[PDB]
Amino acid sequence: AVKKFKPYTPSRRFMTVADFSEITKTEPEKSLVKPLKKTGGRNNQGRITVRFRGGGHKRLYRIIDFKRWDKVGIPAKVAAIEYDPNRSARIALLHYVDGEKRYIIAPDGLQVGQQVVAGPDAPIQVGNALPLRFIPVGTVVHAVELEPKKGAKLARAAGTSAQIQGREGDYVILRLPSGELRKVHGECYATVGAVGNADHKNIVLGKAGRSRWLGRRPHVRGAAMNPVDHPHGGGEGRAPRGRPPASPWGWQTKGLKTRKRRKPSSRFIIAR
Amino acid sequence: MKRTWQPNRRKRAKTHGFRARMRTPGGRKVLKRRRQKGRWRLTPAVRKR
Amino acid sequence: XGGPKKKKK
RNA sequence: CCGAGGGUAGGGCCCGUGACUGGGGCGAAGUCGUAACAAGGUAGCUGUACCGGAAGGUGCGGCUGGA
RNA sequence: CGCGGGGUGGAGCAGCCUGGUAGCUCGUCGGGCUCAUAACCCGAAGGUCGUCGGUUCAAAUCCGGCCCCCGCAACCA
RNA sequence: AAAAUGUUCA
RNA sequence: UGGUUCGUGGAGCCAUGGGGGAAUCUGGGCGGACCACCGCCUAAGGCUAAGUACUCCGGGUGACCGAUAGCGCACCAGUAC
RNA sequence: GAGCUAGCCCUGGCCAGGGUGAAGCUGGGGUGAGACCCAGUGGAGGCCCGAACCGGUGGGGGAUGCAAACCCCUCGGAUGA
RNA sequence: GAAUGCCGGCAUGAGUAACGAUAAAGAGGGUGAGAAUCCCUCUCGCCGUAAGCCCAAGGGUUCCUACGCAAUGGUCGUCAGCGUAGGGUUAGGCGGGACCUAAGGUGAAGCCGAAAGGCGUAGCCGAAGGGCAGCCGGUUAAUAUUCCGGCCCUUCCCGCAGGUGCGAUGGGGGGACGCUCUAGGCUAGGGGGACCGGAGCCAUGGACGAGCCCGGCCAGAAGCGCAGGGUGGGAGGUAGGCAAAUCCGCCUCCCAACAAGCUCUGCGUGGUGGGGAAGCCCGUACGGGUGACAACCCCCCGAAGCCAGGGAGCCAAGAAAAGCCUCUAAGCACAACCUGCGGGAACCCGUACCGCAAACCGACACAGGUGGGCGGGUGCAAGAGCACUCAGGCGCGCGGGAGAACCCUCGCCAAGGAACUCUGCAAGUUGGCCCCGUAACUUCGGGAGAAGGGGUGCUCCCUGGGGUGAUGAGCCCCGGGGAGCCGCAGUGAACAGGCUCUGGCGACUGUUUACCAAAAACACAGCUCUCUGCGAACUCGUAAGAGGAGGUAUAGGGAGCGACGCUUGCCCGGUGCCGGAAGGUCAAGGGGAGGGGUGCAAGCCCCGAACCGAAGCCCCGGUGAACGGCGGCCGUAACUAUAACGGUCCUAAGGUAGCGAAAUUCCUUGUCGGGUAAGUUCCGACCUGCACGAAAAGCGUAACGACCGGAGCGCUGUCUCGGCGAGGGACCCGGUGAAAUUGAACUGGCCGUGAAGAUGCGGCCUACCCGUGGCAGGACGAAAAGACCCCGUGGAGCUUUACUGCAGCC
RNA sequence: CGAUGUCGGCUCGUCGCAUCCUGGGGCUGAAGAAGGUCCCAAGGGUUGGGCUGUUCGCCCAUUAAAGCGGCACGCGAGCUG
Ligand SMILES: NC[C@@H]1O[C@H](O[C@H]2[C@@H](O)[C@H](O[C@@H]3[C@@H](O)[C@H](N)C[C@H](N)[C@H]3O[C@H]3O[C@H](CO)[C@@H](O)[C@H](O)[C@H]3N)O[C@@H]2CO)[C@H](N)[C@@H](O)[C@@H]1O
Ligand SMILES: [Mg+2]
Ligand SMILES: [Mg+2]
Ligand SMILES: [Mg+2]
Ligand SMILES: [Mg+2]
Ligand SMILES: [Mg+2]
Ligand SMILES: [Mg+2]
Ligand SMILES: [Mg+2]
Ligand SMILES: [Mg+2]
Ligand SMILES: [Mg+2]
Ligand SMILES: [Mg+2]
Ligand SMILES: [Mg+2]
Ligand SMILES: [Mg+2]
Ligand SMILES: [Mg+2]
Ligand SMILES: [Mg+2]
Ligand SMILES: [Mg+2]
Ligand SMILES: [Mg+2]
Ligand SMILES: [Mg+2]
Ligand SMILES: [Mg+2]
Ligand SMILES: [Mg+2]
Ligand SMILES: [Mg+2]
Ligand SMILES: [Mg+2]
Ligand SMILES: [Mg+2]
Ligand SMILES: [Mg+2]
Ligand SMILES: [Mg+2]
Ligand SMILES: [Mg+2]
Ligand SMILES: [Mg+2]
Ligand SMILES: [Mg+2]
Ligand SMILES: [Mg+2]
Ligand SMILES: [Mg+2]
Ligand SMILES: [Mg+2]
Ligand SMILES: [Mg+2]
Ligand SMILES: [Mg+2]
Ligand SMILES: [Mg+2]
Ligand SMILES: [Mg+2]
Ligand SMILES: [Mg+2]
Ligand SMILES: [Mg+2]
Ligand SMILES: [Mg+2]
Ligand SMILES: [Mg+2]
Ligand SMILES: [Mg+2]
Ligand SMILES: [Mg+2]
Ligand SMILES: [Mg+2]
Ligand SMILES: [Mg+2]
Ligand SMILES: [Mg+2]
Ligand SMILES: [Mg+2]
Ligand SMILES: [Mg+2]
Ligand SMILES: [Mg+2]
Ligand SMILES: [Mg+2]
Ligand SMILES: [Mg+2]
Ligand SMILES: [Mg+2]
Ligand SMILES: [Mg+2]
Ligand SMILES: [Mg+2]
Ligand SMILES: [Mg+2]
Ligand SMILES: [Mg+2]
Ligand SMILES: [Mg+2]
Ligand SMILES: [Mg+2]
Ligand SMILES: [Mg+2]
Ligand SMILES: [Mg+2]
Ligand SMILES: [Mg+2]
Ligand SMILES: [Mg+2]
Ligand SMILES: [Mg+2]
Ligand SMILES: [Mg+2]
Ligand SMILES: [Mg+2]
Ligand SMILES: [Mg+2]
Ligand SMILES: [Mg+2]
Ligand SMILES: [Mg+2]
Ligand SMILES: [Mg+2]
Ligand SMILES: [Mg+2]
Ligand SMILES: [Mg+2]
Ligand SMILES: [Mg+2]
Ligand SMILES: [Mg+2]
Ligand SMILES: [Mg+2]
Ligand SMILES: [Mg+2]
Ligand SMILES: [Mg+2]
Ligand SMILES: [Mg+2]
Ligand SMILES: [Mg+2]
Ligand SMILES: [Mg+2]
Ligand SMILES: [Mg+2]
Ligand SMILES: [Mg+2]
Ligand SMILES: [Mg+2]
Ligand SMILES: [Mg+2]
Ligand SMILES: [Mg+2]
Ligand SMILES: [Mg+2]
Ligand SMILES: [Mg+2]
Numbered sequence A: 001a002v003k004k005f006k007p008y009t010p011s012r013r014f015m016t017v018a019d020f021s022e023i024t025k026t027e028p029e030k031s032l033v034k035p036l037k038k039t040g041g042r043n044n045q046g047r048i049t050v051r052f053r054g055g056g057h058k059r060l061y062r063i064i065d066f067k068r069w070d071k072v073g074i075p076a077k078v079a080a081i082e083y084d085p086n087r088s089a090r091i092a093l094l095h096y097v098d099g100e101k102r103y104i105i106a107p108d109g110l111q112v113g114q115q116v117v118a119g120p121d122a123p124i125q126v127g128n129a130l131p132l133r134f135i136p137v138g139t140v141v142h143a144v145e146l147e148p149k150k151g152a153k154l155a156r157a158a159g160t161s162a163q164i165q166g167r168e169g170d171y172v173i174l175r176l177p178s179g180e181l182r183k184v185h186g187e188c189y190a191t192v193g194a195v196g197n198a199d200h201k202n203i204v205l206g207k208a209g210r211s212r213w214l215g216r217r218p219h220v221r222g223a224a225m226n227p228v229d230h231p232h233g234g235g236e237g238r239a240p241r242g243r244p245p246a247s248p249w250g251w252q253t254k255g256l257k258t259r260k261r262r263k264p265s266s267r268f269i270i271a272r
Numbered sequence B: 001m002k003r004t005w006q007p008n009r010r011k012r013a014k015t016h017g018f019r020a021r022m023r024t025p026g027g028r029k030v031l032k033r034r035r036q037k038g039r040w041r042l043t044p045a046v047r048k049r
Numbered sequence C: 001x002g003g004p005k006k007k008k009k
Numbered sequence D: 001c002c003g004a005g006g007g008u009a010g011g012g013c014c015c016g017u018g019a020c021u022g023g024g025g026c027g028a029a030g031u032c033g034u035a036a037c038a039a040g041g042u043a044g045c046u047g048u049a050c051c052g053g054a055a056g057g058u059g060c061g062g063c064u065g066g067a
Numbered sequence E: 001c002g003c004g005g006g007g008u009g010g011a012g013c014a015g016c017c018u019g020g021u022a023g024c025u026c027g028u029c030g031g032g033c034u035c036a037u038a039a040c041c042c043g044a045a046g047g048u049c050g051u052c053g054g055u056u057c058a059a060a061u062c063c064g065g066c067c068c069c070c071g072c073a074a075c076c077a
Numbered sequence F: 001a002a003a004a005u006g007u008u009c010a
Numbered sequence G: 001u002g003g004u005u006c007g008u009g010g011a012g013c014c015a016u017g018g019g020g021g022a023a024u025c026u027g028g029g030c031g032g033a034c035c036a037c038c039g040c041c042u043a044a045g046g047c048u049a050a051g052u053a054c055u056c057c058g059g060g061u062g063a064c065c066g067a068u069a070g071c072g073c074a075c076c077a078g079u080a081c
Numbered sequence H: 001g002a003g004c005u006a007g008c009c010c011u012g013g014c015c016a017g018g019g020u021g022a023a024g025c026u027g028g029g030g031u032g033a034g035a036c037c038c039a040g041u042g043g044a045g046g047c048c049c050g051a052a053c054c055g056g057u058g059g060g061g062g063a064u065g066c067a068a069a070c071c072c073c074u075c076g077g078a079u080g081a
Numbered sequence I: 001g002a003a004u005g006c007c008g009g010c011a012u013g014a015g016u017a018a019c020g021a022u023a024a025a026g027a028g029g030g031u032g033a034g035a036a037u038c039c040c041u042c043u044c045g046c047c048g049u050a051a052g053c054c055c056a057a058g059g060g061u062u063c064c065u066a067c068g069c070a071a072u073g074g075u076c077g078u079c080a081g082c083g084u085a086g087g088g089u090u091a092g093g094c095g096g097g098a099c100c101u102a103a104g105g106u107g108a109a110g111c112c113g114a115a116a117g118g119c120g121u122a123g124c125c126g127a128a129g130g131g132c133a134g135c136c137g138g139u140u141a142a143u144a145u146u147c148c149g150g151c152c153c154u155u156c157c158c159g160c161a162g163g164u165g166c167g168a169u170g171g172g173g174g175g176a177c178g179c180u181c182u183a184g185g186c187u188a189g190g191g192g193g194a195c196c197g198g199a200g201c202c203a204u205g206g207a208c209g210a211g212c213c214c215g216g217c218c219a220g221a222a223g224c225g226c227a228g229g230g231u232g233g234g235a236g237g238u239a240g241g242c243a244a245a246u247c248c249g250c251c252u253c254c255c256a257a258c259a260a261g262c263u264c265u266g267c268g269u270g271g272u273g274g275g276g277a278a279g280c281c282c283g284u285a286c287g288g289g290u291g292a293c294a295a296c297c298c299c300c301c302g303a304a305g306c307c308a309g310g311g312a313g314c315c316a317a318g319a320a321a322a323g324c325c326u327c328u329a330a331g332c333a334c335a336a337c338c339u340g341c342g343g344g345a346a347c348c349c350g351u352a353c354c355g356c357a358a359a360c361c362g363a364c365a366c367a368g369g370u371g372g373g374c375g376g377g378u379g380c381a382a383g384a385g386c387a388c389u390c391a392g393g394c395g396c397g398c399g400g401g402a403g404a405a406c407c408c409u410c411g412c413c414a415a416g417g418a419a420c421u422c423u424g425c426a427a428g429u430u431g432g433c434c435c436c437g438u439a440a441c442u443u444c445g446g447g448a449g450a451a452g453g454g455g456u457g458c459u460c461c462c463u464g465g466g467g468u469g470a471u472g473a474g475c476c477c478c479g480g481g482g483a484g485c486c487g488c489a490g491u492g493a494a495c496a497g498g499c500u501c502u503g504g505c506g507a508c509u510g511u512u513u514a515c516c517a518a519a520a521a522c523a524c525a526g527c528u529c530u531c532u533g534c535g536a537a538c539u540c541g542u543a544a545g546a547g548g549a550g551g552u553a554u555a556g557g558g559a560g561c562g563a564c565g566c567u568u569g570c571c572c573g574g575u576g577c578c579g580g581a582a583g584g585u586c587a588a589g590g591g592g593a594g595g596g597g598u599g600c601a602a603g604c605c606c607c608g609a610a611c612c613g614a615a616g617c618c619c620c621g622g623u624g625a626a627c628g629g630c631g632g633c634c635g636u637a638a639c640u641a642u643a644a645c646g647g648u649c650c651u652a653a654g655g656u657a658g659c660g661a662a663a664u665u666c667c668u669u670g671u672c673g674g675g676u677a678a679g680u681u682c683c684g685a686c687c688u689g690c691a692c693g694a695a696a697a698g699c700g701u702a703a704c705g706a707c708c709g710g711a712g713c714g715c716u717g718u719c720u721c722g723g724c725g726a727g728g729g730a731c732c733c734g735g736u737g738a739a740a741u742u743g744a745a746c747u748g749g750c751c752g753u754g755a756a757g758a759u760g761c762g763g764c765c766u767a768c769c770c771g772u773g774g775c776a777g778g779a780c781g782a783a784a785a786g787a788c789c790c791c792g793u794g795g796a797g798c799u800u801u802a803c804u805g806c807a808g809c810c
Numbered sequence J: 001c002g003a004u005g006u007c008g009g010c011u012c013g014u015c016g017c018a019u020c021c022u023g024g025g026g027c028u029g030a031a032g033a034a035g036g037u038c039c040c041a042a043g044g045g046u047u048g049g050g051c052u053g054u055u056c057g058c059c060c061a062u063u064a065a066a067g068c069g070g071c072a073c074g075c076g077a078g079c080u081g
């Protein structure tokens, strides 16, 4: 839906906030299962190695369930859907009859009170997790494992999915959010449905501060700098570059393919 | 204005203390040099309890 | 002193 | 007290005027091209969109005031 | 002032560096086709090559001096 | 298959 | 590739990182590419005084200084600052 | 050497008093149901005035200064990057 | 004898500048060898969201006291923060540690690295964060939540008395958290009082009065009382909480849905304890006595503080661990644990004093810097603002005279109002609140405090709402209406926008050159391009490792543009990037035609042609929101003029829209038009654009601006054009007393001359010796071995299709 | 070049005359008035604005006239910037 504001201030005239109506009466989270201390820090042991990180709201990590094959066969009741500061998506709090409480990343269409479960069994319904094989060709799916028993790694961003395209002996072909065509092992779990919160892309930050709230420090142009700092630094009053556009570290930034050629992963990929 | 000396007993101790110098080869040599020199004070005297 | 002023005037 | 009126400030409607600019009307025999009327030599017209010295061209849908 | 590029039939351009041979398009002229014009077709004419010098057996062509034309430069005070 | 034009008034 | 006077030089010898990979005296390395001949040695295990270097320390001497010199310090100096 | 300074991390503190009056609520109106409109409530904001506080715009003084960046008048922000 | 030489010493300027805020001093009396400066009294001024109190950091004897003045004090000094000596810092409850965990540090296992070393889950360390039991008075010259007095708590250990399956570093719960706004009841704090208590006081015209003045509390266990915070009670089933659980979690039936009940705080009350003014009398360098049997009560305002883990709303979604409760396991249940009561035990370090400053950071008794808490009263709408003033603390460690110039800081001015000037720079006008009233434009919010105005004090009368009180008196808040009074003037003092029109740039709040640039630079939301399938790309590190990210294409890295609106054209030849299992070239290596050297020979040893040989380059395509680029010359229309139209050469293609003398326009003050008496500027136009132009974006855009330009009104000392006055200096006297500089000096003008700008040489002229206050023409004045410039086969930063390497990648 | 601060403005001036005005004079194609030109003469005087950093210049309103130069394109230990 997206919340919109009137221009009672500049920067409030474009600004735009998510709709939280799917956030069920459960705004503060769940101890026990999560949260952990989350360790803010824009850099490695010592030095900054990703520029322009820092500031922005304190967070608690929700330790979510990315391998659903523990509770094969054990169903769970979806108890709530809550805000997760550390991902684009929303998260489902679910209660297993087992007693155990996990969070699942919350798919589009998930309703509270719903039944959900994981395993070879598993009715093909939104919320359920299955090894890729038993899932019908053509159904859209998410939180897909890359290699079996290694955890969900594909399609967890808000409003993303992959679609099952066909099969090939032990592998089923996937069409990933990027549009790539991937052979992913049959035995990999993946949960049916799309991610949801799909209006995430429609949000307009609206002002500088908002950027900072999310811990995004000001990014400065190479043009703004000096020859010591950047290939684009200097010279006089503005300058068009004077070389093929580059990163600060000298590599070209328009076109230069960067995936290494001889990756053994290659023989499992069929697209862009 | 604000000058450059902003005394702190903990800082002076953690920074220039006998135990800091002892911790690394760089520092151990400092004690060696100061000893051979005949320095009355190997490290700065940080006070208080 | 140590300068550090540049030769202006 | 009110008060003709004068003063100060700020709006509204109308008239006149202005370097320049826009298209228009009209003025026998100036220029360029051929759009339309015959199937006008690409049927025409059309709303819209883009483009082109100019009529105009073309895309999409429509019409018979054409086959 | 300095630099380097150019004047070739009526118009716009080749031809030079490896000297002896001036060609292309348009235009012009004569003839056709058309009722007539253009378009189109067949023929033809037209160049002291900016000048002054000489280098050579021979100069559009190579070398000097002027004459216009075009472009670049004139910085630090 | 391609083919433009015909000064003004009677 | 390093070492040797040897800077690829005709470049050996001595070390070695990589690859291949023997032999036990009729076996093996060397005498400056290489081959022959003639000779010198016996690798891939280790220990070994003395002669040599040095002067914190003790002593002796001086065509060494004599308090701006001689060590930074002749004096409670690596102090005061 | 980051006790100045730059950034980030962890944990605390601070921001007088005034204004302006968004969403949303409640009532009324309207409609087939709506959209929407009126109040009333509400208290939003890199919102406004303005101390503390953080600054350093303009001018004057200062120039072996009170001061190796100060002082006077004036001025920017002041619930947020 | 020289090196702007080095060390030291002493001169010069010089009794000159200065003596550190313009908050301010006068006098009497002491003490003393000696007093503007020390002690005391009186008078005066200054601070009072401090220039007053209390901590933290830091400082380390500065604290108190005795005796002292050589030096330190910008003067003096009998004084001191200085010298000599002595004295002073008391804790189970405050803080820190025998408690906990955060970032981070360290680090067993383990991984890595030529060595030194680097990483690293557990654990440990690590603190104004979590946890934790003292409040109020009294004493010292100097310490007190520490000693003492009263009242009240905390742990251990050993006992008795009784309760129960007790019981782990293990499980679970709790602890436990954001921002903004907030309700109810309290306390701190404050105002008032005809009531209570007090020494006193009638002055100078009047007042013996419900008169003036001063003061009317604090702490306090249990139990209450009032606020409020926490929390459902059962019974079954159970596969999860990494062993086990009765616990928790998940189901299913009952009763509650209430704070009824359990507890937990806060506040009142409380056995009792303590305090207790003005004034007067005393002797202090200060404290004491009395006032006292002191009284110790009633209203009112009221928090940002307490009840606290309260409530509501919002998005950016808001530490951990232990104490604490509980569950069980090994063990053991003559243990052990819990409740109650007794006795006993309760360590280590800090405590002085400064603490917005003369004791900390600035070489100084330095006008600067320095974190937290309290910060009273009145009035001005409020308030931590502003003026004065409680308490408290100061008059800033040189003074005394004088009444010049000139400077600083400030007040006022005839008439004119910007004529000043690069510019209204500066200074003035305006100014608070309440109420009328407000334009273009606009993204519908704004522009708005538009602009422009009126009201503002005091007296009396009438009157409407609340709040606390019972539905009332009072006390406290908002109002309305009507008469009237005075002054030049009613936010009468102090704090408090000048306004408008129109361009340029940037959307905007923001950020920036600490120490000359705050902007149109940077950033910014947003747009696009590109990279990246996750052991991601990218980055740091030799590596291990880590960031990215405990993220996963709505994600992350790089680049450009920089809200928004309308848009962003043509060129892929060159350069870059992307795509091409062909072809050309291609290094090691494979391959050996064949040749060479030695050998009597088998052999040993050299070279070495075909051919097989990757990437890269070539080559073939693609690609401009990739690096970039986007023409010239002639002719032509029935007045001329101009050229829709034509020819031609060249290119990879020959700048479209929109804009244009521009932050771009050289010729240039282009030419018209506007504003002005007059306008190299400014605005609007024309287009001949030296040399605009579409994401190094193009043209516009409401709002916004310590940005830049133009104009106008208002208003002025900016000016015409100055004048007067104030104080701080200057000046004189007493005291203390520098500096840069300096070859030496007995240092005149002119005209000449001289290395070409003479006090010093020549000629003439003028001029008794020496100071003080001033002015700056000169001593090519001072200060810095010229920053410009050039030189040196001097040095650095940067660049690239300069050379040669290296990382990285292939 | 071990430093001579470099434009213009303000301020304060002073000097040369090859004079802008005023005084005196010759010639005039000088009727008069008003001009033209040359000689003598510097004693004194030589405005205020708009524009521009400007010097200069162009303008507006005047005037007896709106003089020209030198003095380190006079004058920054005088100011401005
Ligand atoms: N008046 C007609 C409107 O204006 C235009 O028409 C104007 C012109 O286009 C037109 O020009 C014509 C031209 O078309 C035609 N081929 C040649 C003719 N000689 C011209 O004529 C014009 O110019 C001449 C002067 O020389 C005048 O005398 C005459 O009046 C005038 N019509 O003359 C018209 C003025 O009267 C549009 N073309 C027409 O379609 C429109 O409806
Ligand atoms: Mg926890
Ligand atoms: Mg690192
Ligand atoms: Mg480290
Ligand atoms: Mg940027
Ligand atoms: Mg820059
Ligand atoms: Mg660079
Ligand atoms: Mg440029
Ligand atoms: Mg560049
Ligand atoms: Mg009009
Ligand atoms: Mg036709
Ligand atoms: Mg047709
Ligand atoms: Mg047609
Ligand atoms: Mg159409
Ligand atoms: Mg077309
Ligand atoms: Mg220069
Ligand atoms: Mg025709
Ligand atoms: Mg006809
Ligand atoms: Mg006729
Ligand atoms: Mg060698
Ligand atoms: Mg060998
Ligand atoms: Mg040998
Ligand atoms: Mg030999
Ligand atoms: Mg041998
Ligand atoms: Mg001797
Ligand atoms: Mg001697
Ligand atoms: Mg010595
Ligand atoms: Mg010595
Ligand atoms: Mg409302
Ligand atoms: Mg508000
Ligand atoms: Mg604000
Ligand atoms: Mg403000
Ligand atoms: Mg700053
Ligand atoms: Mg000599
Ligand atoms: Mg000197
Ligand atoms: Mg000396
Ligand atoms: Mg003097
Ligand atoms: Mg003097
Ligand atoms: Mg003096
Ligand atoms: Mg003083
Ligand atoms: Mg005495
Ligand atoms: Mg006062
Ligand atoms: Mg002492
Ligand atoms: Mg003392
Ligand atoms: Mg003294
Ligand atoms: Mg002093
Ligand atoms: Mg004494
Ligand atoms: Mg003392
Ligand atoms: Mg404690
Ligand atoms: Mg102990
Ligand atoms: Mg610990
Ligand atoms: Mg840790
Ligand atoms: Mg470590
Ligand atoms: Mg500890
Ligand atoms: Mg604590
Ligand atoms: Mg138990
Ligand atoms: Mg626990
Ligand atoms: Mg009387
Ligand atoms: Mg009590
Ligand atoms: Mg279990
Ligand atoms: Mg008493
Ligand atoms: Mg709450
Ligand atoms: Mg622990
Ligand atoms: Mg436990
Ligand atoms: Mg104490
Ligand atoms: Mg104390
Ligand atoms: Mg004390
Ligand atoms: Mg303070
Ligand atoms: Mg002082
Ligand atoms: Mg001070
Ligand atoms: Mg402060
Ligand atoms: Mg207060
Ligand atoms: Mg007020
Ligand atoms: Mg104040
Ligand atoms: Mg006046
Ligand atoms: Mg007047
Ligand atoms: Mg006026
Ligand atoms: Mg003017
Ligand atoms: Mg003027
Ligand atoms: Mg101006
Ligand atoms: Mg001003
Ligand atoms: Mg403006
Ligand atoms: Mg503007
Ligand atoms: Mg801006």
Ligand SMILES: [Mg+2]
Binding pocket: none
């Ligand atoms: Mg700003």
Ligand SMILES: [Mg+2]
Binding pocket: I513
């Ligand atoms: Mg600066």
Ligand SMILES: [Mg+2]
Binding pocket: none
């Ligand atoms: Mg500045």
Ligand SMILES: [Mg+2]
Binding pocket: I518, I706
């Ligand atoms: Mg600014």
Ligand SMILES: [Mg+2]
Binding pocket: none
């Ligand atoms: Mg990683």
Ligand SMILES: [Mg+2]
Binding pocket: I549, I550
């Ligand atoms: Mg991570």
Ligand SMILES: [Mg+2]
Binding pocket: none
């Ligand atoms: Mg990206």
Ligand SMILES: [Mg+2]
Binding pocket: none
């Ligand atoms: Mg930009």
Ligand SMILES: [Mg+2]
Binding pocket: none
């Ligand atoms: Mg920009």
Ligand SMILES: [Mg+2]
Binding pocket: none
């Ligand atoms: Mg821009």
Ligand SMILES: [Mg+2]
Binding pocket: I572
């Ligand atoms: Mg191509």
Ligand SMILES: [Mg+2]
Binding pocket: I572
């Ligand atoms: Mg190209």
Ligand SMILES: [Mg+2]
Binding pocket: I572
């Ligand atoms: Mg290309």
Ligand SMILES: [Mg+2]
Binding pocket: none
């Ligand atoms: Mg390629």
Ligand SMILES: [Mg+2]
Binding pocket: none
């Ligand atoms: Mg190849």
Ligand SMILES: [Mg+2]
Binding pocket: none
């Ligand atoms: Mg483009």
